[PDB]
Design a protein around this ligand. Structure first.
Ligand SMILES: *Cc1c(COP(=O)(O)O)cnc(C)c1O
Ligand SMILES: *Cc1c(COP(=O)(O)O)cnc(C)c1O
Ligand SMILES: [Cl-]
Ligand SMILES: [Cl-]
Lengths: 404, 404
């Protein structure tokens, strides 16, 4: 592959116009949109309106006159289009850690009636730390004998899922390796074994095709600030299968989840449907900007984005081997597309130092322990040519030992 | 009292210059800053910088290069100055409902070791609904025999607090009546009885003098979007007495509360101190604007604000009686200052209709069930003359039966 081949790929790229809907800083090749999505141009004006007009002038009236009262649900309805969910099934609220607590609590309470004695939550050792920590906090508070089974690889999951399994809790795309689980198959296997399946979509929603209904998933959660480009710390989302949602309340039972059809008397009464997963007053300025990120996706579809994403990661892996073969890089992301998300990770003995030398030259990925260099490929605003230019900078750094 | 007396009060008002630090809409007399605080002028430019510069240009780098990593703690440190807390004791994160869940869980777990068999959480029937609902959700998830004792008036609290009381959970200023508890005395009595004391400061922080250390309080939570003027749905805060903080973990154990001195391995390890009450990634744009509200308070103190607040509520009550005596208004807020917060509530048979007729004329309070008309007085940006003008509009409405 040559630079000219990459320039041609960009010329043929039907998604090219969508890049213009983002305000990217000059000179930067941003390969960390899997950790903080780049900014849609419209986010600035949207926030200016929330602040100056809705808050500043409307004040408390804006709960009605600016639509704030149903923002979590309208945003959920938009996001649903990207994950095989329907209207009235998704809300955007709180954070991924919090939402996981809500659905894991709901799942264990469903299984306490259905199948008591089931006490194990199966997951992976390399799961995103907060998912582990939240599951550990919940189990520690409940007692007992709720315990966590950490499995050291994806292939060991089937033997760890058995009659003792209350819940299988997995992040669909591994935050370190970029390995992608087969959602439908691991869900079917969880159900076969009697367990409910909870999927963290942080590295999936807006990155790869997801269809929660088709997969038979029970609960899901994820972030809007990564591939969905919602802004820094923008609120997470939660989806619950209509089969399960109204069976039990979730424990973070704040007033926004109270039924809207009856007055707020001393006794909590949950809303029918997903609105029961609402809790408290949401940071509105940050919440409103989620819309700007979602709006860009409306101009294409996840099949088209998946296609460009695979072309970008294929190109990155190929170019790194082509240009940097004579250095000590080890691919940790699967070569096989069905097991691949939208990022690529290489290990390197001085991976931290190389990542910082790259950042020092405007090529921004990130470092994960141990020794992993992670690069996210975001087809909405990443070009093929900038992949070439990024690898050339990496090659220059490695050849010159700039990292030292 | 006359309008000219009010004009003179404004001329003598040493706090008058602080009003100019808020961008208020023309023609509005805003008496709902106890529900959504008015906008500091600086909030717009602050958000513009977060969006355009920190997010848009800095991207993921801003976790370091814009201070995002310690924002919750720096904001907590600022807020601490207003509630008798010290550095390293307060964080601004999540919402009041969520934070209450964190501290109530911590309190019950402390009491499960200290004094098992204690199973009652005492509170009031007229407590803000979400506080009740969160306590109900937690008790319902734990089991058992955790139960809630709802007390129908402030004077009935002493007899409800006994040897069975794990926790006394109270909102310091009643959201409906504006009645203010004696924090120090009810805390002392809770401790005398063996209970821990949790105080919701939603209608207290930034409104009345608070000193959590002097009061001997165990845990506290509150909002930044009311009297602290942080913006719509701006994040809540939580304080924990240093005596208790490190005794147990709180159950919403997300990664931001992990110790910063050690790597993020599979096992959660809480930070020493208040940082353990952090959980997940916070909505940064909304969080940053909390600073603008806190900054105004730095230019005065809570004694001075308390003084002007009492002068405003005294004036409102007096003017309403002076001008509206011949109508069916019933004062529900205590006349006695030591039992009074910073708002005034009147009951009226058609209270809802009167509140909307007032809103229709730009005088904005709110309606609480049943039949309560609530008006918040915010000395940072409320003038004495606008109190006069508001009452004159109320008088015109009542005389003409405009509410019909
Ligand atoms: C305003 C208020 C709340 C708000 O709760 P959120 O979870 O922030 O919506 C809670 N409790 C009390 C007493 C309040 O006054
Ligand atoms: C990004 C990410 C999170 C973030 O959690 P917050 O509570 O939003 O900070 C959680 N889990 C996974 C798998 C992630 O990729
Ligand atoms: Cl990540
Ligand atoms: Cl309120």
């Amino acid at each position: 592959t040559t630079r000219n081949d990459c320039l041609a790929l960009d010329a043929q790229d039907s998604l090219a116009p969508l890049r213009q809907q983002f305000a990217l800083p000059e000179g930067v090749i941003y390969l960390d949109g899997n950790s903080l999505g780049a900014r849609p141009v419209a986010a600035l004006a949207r926030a200016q309106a929330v602040i100056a007009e809705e808050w500043g002038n409307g004040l408390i009236r804006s709960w009605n006159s600016a639509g704030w009262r149903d923002l979590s649900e309208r945003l959920g309805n938009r996001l649903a289009t990207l994950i095989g969910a329907r209207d009235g099934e998704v809300v955007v609220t709180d954070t991924t850690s919090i939402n996981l607590f809500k659905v894991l609590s709901a799942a264990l309470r469903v299984q306490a009636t259905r199948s008591p004695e089931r006490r194990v939550i199966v997951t992976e050792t390399s799961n995103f730390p907060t998912d582990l920590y939240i599951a550990e906090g919940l189990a520690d508070m409940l007692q007992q004998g709720y315990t966590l089974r950490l499995v050291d690889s994806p292939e060991e999951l089937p033997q760890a899922i058995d009659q003792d399994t209350a819940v299988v809790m997995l992040t669909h795309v591994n935050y370190k390796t970029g390995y992608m689980h087969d959602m439908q198959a691991l869900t079917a296997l969880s159900h076969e074994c009697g367990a409910l399946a909870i999927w963290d979509l942080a590295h999936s929603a807006g990155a790869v095709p997801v269809d929660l209904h088709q997969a038979g998933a029970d609960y899901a959660i994820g972030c809007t600030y990564k591939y969905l480009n919602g802004g820094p710390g923008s609120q997470a989302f939660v989806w619950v299968s209509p089969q399960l949602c109204d069976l039990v309340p979730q424990p973070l039972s704040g007033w926004f989840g109270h039924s809207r059809q009856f007055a707020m008397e001393p006794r909590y009464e949950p809303s029918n449907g997903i609105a029961r997963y609402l809790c408290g007053t949401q940071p509105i300025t940050s919440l409103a900007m989620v819309e700007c990120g979602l709006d860009v996706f409306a101009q294409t579809d996840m099949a088209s984005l998946r296609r460009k994403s695979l072309a970008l990661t294929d190109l990155f892996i190929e170019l790194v081997e082509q240009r940097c073969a004579a250095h000590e890089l080890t691919l940790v992301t699967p070569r096989e597309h069905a097991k691949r998300g939208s990022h690529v990770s290489f290990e390197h003995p001085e991976g931290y130092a190389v990542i910082q030398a790259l950042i020092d030259r405007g090529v921004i990925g990130d470092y994960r322990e141990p020794r992993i260099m992670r690069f996210g490929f975001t087809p909405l605003y990443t070009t093929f040519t900038e992949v070439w230019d990024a690898v050339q900078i990496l090659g220059e750094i490695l050849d010159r030992k700039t990292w030292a």
